[PDB]
Design a protein around this ligand. Sequence first.
Ligand SMILES: Nc1ncnc2[nH]ccc(=O)c12
Length: 303
Amino acid sequence: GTIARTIVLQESIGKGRFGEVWRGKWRGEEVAVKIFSSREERSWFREAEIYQTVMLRHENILGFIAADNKDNGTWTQLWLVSDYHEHGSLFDYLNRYTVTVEGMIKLALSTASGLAHLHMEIVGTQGKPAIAHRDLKSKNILVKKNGTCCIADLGLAVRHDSATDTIDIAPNHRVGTKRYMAPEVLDDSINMKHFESFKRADIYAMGLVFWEIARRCSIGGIHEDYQLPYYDLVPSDPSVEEMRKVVCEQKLRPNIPNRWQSCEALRVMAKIMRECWYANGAARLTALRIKKTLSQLSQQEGI
Ligand SMILES: Nc1ncnc2[nH]ccc(=O)c12
């Protein structure tokens, strides 16, 4: 293609389960290129399909540029070109840095604004269907130069046809990162024909993400070391069983240190986390309500 032939790959920045991410230069600008092999076409095509959803572009959704293919003379590579964010993942950003209260609210609100857009159905001729991430985690959220997030890795997404209340790919199996799986996903009680269930499962995962950010918030040089949710209860790369035992049976969640009650911003973040973590998906906050809360918190702080 015309786009892939003009892109120079400079650095392989990640090797995931579906495709490898490269830092490339396009028309003198930095771009991220997700490359898939010939045998990963279904993964590539689906992610292109999601990223090309009508009215998807949003400041807190990774900016998609193009799908393309590149023949190097021996084999074809399937490309997905998108915006490049030098900070990379929220995961890397939180491992590397601590944030201020202003910084924390910025990352949390942008994530919630991006998820609220994804979840929001826009009716019209240029209508946008409601979309559920299904694999929301700190490794799938990128951090922009201005200190705000954007949701990335939309390849596992599902889209809602609101008129019939049917999901475009009618999921029949559990997907996503085990650590971040909602209680109803771990114990397989989730109604996979119920789109609102998927949005609720995303909210649970966002609550875990907020916890990771809040730990790295530095007030009076006090903060926790970076940790994945449940680091204190499950091993690295946990199994569904290891997760179900903790999240569903023992019904534990990431610990909220009492000192988060000391700060107004961490109090708001802690109440949100708790209202994301309810074992019953229906009691959980909606992403739009979280966006409303944090927007109301940000304006006061003066961001
Ligand atoms: N688009 C991006 N920009 C910068 N870093 C990234 N790392 C991993 C996956 C991405 O998509 C990405």
